[PDB]
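Re: magnesium ion structure - here you go.
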Amino acid sequence: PKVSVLITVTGVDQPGVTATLFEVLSRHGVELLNVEQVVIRHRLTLGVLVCCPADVADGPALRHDVEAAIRKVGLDVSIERSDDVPIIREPSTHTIFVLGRPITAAAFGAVAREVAALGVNIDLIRGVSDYPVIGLELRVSVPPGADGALRTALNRVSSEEHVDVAVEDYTLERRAKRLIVFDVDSTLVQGEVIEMLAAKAGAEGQVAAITDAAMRGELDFAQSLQQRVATLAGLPATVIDEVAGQLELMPGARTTLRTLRRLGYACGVVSGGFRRIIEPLAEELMLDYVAANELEIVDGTLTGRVVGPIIDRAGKATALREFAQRAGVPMAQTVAVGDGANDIDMLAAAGLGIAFNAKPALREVADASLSHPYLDTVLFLLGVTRGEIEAADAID
Amino acid sequence: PKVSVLITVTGVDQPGVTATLFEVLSRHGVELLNVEQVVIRHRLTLGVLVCCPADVADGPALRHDVEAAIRKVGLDVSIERSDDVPIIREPSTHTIFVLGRPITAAAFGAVAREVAALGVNIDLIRGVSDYPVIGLELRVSVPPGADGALRTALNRVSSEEHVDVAVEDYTLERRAKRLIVFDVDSTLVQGEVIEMLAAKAGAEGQVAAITDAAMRGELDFAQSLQQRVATLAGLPATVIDEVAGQLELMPGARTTLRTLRRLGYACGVVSGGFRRIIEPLAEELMLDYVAANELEIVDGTLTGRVVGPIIDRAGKATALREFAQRAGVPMAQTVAVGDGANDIDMLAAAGLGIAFNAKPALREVADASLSHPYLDTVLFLLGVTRGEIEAADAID
Ligand SMILES: [Mg+2]
Ligand SMILES: [Mg+2]
């Protein structure tokens, strides 16, 4: 097994090329060291590294046979002895997802600039969706220490150019994610249950004020929730059923969970809302775990307080950890998706922390930020493509 | 968002191309529909589908700008309006793994012939290992109903050309495999414990006869095991410790399990050997589950019989199923790796049934057959590459 020899075929794709090339190579004394091939928009590139004897390699026989056979039918072929060339490419270090509606060329351009500026090469680019959102994957190779810089760079690009840009490690380990938890209110579920409840009271205004203030940061969650729930004092606890079946799942939420089931994920929710309303829905969606606060009921009437302990911001993290343990999933292989500053400790604690249509407070400490009203775009940050979802769904 | 326009750049890779192309496209009115890119052996192919107005598209402005910018620095670019072209490629239907030592060009050729004969196209080829075994992945698109035929075709190729050839579904679901069970004897572990025990008795000959006969098919496993274990009557049960720490893990077994842990697999063994010898080792390798037969000991002496129930061929399947349930993994998302006709019901029952250096009896009903004395090659049939293993291992 003397010298290495590199055959590279390019040109417009045609049937039988791969087979024609290897049938030819078999007439000489050839063993395969590596093979790479792809067709992009009817452009073939076929890259073969072979290990033949010094006899066969430095002999005009092999060269003229391959050159005759490729050129005879359309394509081009180069042939060069190396003995200095890598056999099998090292893996990408990271992967970057770009989601937009639309993704302007200008947006994509800004991404590549920052990538190139920071010494990163692009190993591959592919699409991972067309609808509801255009999704593009770049698998990249990042110099050590550029990692902190590159996210910084791309996060400016994100806000400027109006696309979602996420950077994830492209490792074996941190790719086998297997536990995900969703916030409920304005994540898995359209809107805020507590405003829907406060509306029954006639207090949607007082509450939606404090509500859009606590999940933005201005108010402590505990003292906010007590002042918010208080407004419900007097309501008949049948209000909980009314608002429960008044709820609308976020766009794509069913698709999101179904696909997560297909991939064998443990799924659960961690909320500061109310078990009574949530558990009804978590049965429907076959959830593995629920953590919520609880409304104190006295003679079929809410008293405007809750039954401790309070799932506060620290509570959400603690609940993710407890869920991780019972299911036997390391923390780094866990995912959290939430929208408010409520969700800061949870997202930080999780392996991959995703902010969904989230207040600036969360979108500034989250691993990844989505900004379209489609929860299924969570799947693209987890390595899934639309075409895959679409395929799997069609076999029922 | 009028007509679609397809830009395709090819040529020898150079820094800044991706960015140069999109910076240019931003000066016109362009939104990205799809992007595909790869560099194989310094050959760039960049494939962009854009969605610009009828104004921009049918205007010589865009064409001359892109054409000037690409050609100015080395590469070629075509540009054609389509409005009839697919946006985002459908996924591969299956994936084929070719493992050899070596993989001759002739071997690879035979694979591509059968592929082409049966109407299948190759979407991608990449390497997934160089050592210990050359590994090559072909992601293919298979016409419906060709599936049964294609495995048939490639299985002849396998035996003729001296490579391992496996065909797996390339679906979302049947790719998220998460539970694997190994046979112990001549799978996870070098050799046969019961011959190592029978040797202590002075009965290696009588036993290795019947042993290499039952895991080939000629003898019923129960009546074989009773006649085999019988030969141990009289031995002091301290023999079990002696043979336990006389065992050698199959080449790569530690790497196999470690990687499986990284990927968050439940791992276990299902044996017709002896809990007393096996459990010692299963603690070491942090196994989630053990199923084995058990040696009847009377006053520190083996009696040559076992304590029922007997893990027979049907037992192994039943044990996999029980393991699947306790861990909450559907059967189709389970993996079994074994070597004897002992392992037929288990491998059939499993989602993916892998025969490892296995008797013809198993290698004729197993989903996939390996034939090299390296158990880590199990990982390549599970979508892992050497470079990935090598990367993950190096971060400790
Ligand atoms: Mg929230
Ligand atoms: Mg066996």
